[PDB]
Amino acid sequence: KKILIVDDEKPISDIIKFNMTKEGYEVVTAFNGREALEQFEAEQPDIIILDLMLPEIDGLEVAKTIRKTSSVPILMLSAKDSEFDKVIGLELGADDYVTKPFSNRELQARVKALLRR
Ligand code: BEF
Ligand SMILES: [Mn+2]
């Protein structure tokens, strides 16, 4: 299965890529909202882990845009942890929303849960 990791912070992207690689997933990365939409269209990932505070296009806009044509599972992963943040992310189409800092094991379990459908 292929995972697209969207995060503008390379250190965070690297930790998630390391962990998902360990589970046997193919990993593709994007460092801004524009790269996120470009990788989504070119790679057709099976699941997207999506940061919200991103340059060019924010994660909420990336999710809304992607939802116009795809039901690809989206797991939002952000330091933004307010009730409004989680509710709007889910209402715009996210299937799950995890806050930073996060547990690598819990992220792995939620990706498996989403892929399980
Ligand atoms: F920049 Be992400 F929203 F933590
Ligand atoms: Mn960010």
UniProtKB/Swiss-Prot annotation:
Modification 4-aspartylphosphate occurs at: D51
GO biological process, one term: fatty acid biosynthetic process
The keyword DNA damage appears for this protein: no
Molecular functions per Gene Ontology: cis-regulatory region sequence-specific DNA binding; phosphorelay response regulator activity
PTM per Swiss-Prot/TrEMBL: Phosphorylated by WalK; can also be dephosphorylated by WalK.
Any one GO CC term of the record: protein-DNA complex
Protein name: Transcriptional regulatory protein WalR
Lineage summary: Bacteria, Bacillati, Bacillota, Bacilli, Lactobacillales
Portion of the parent chain present: 2 to 118 of 234
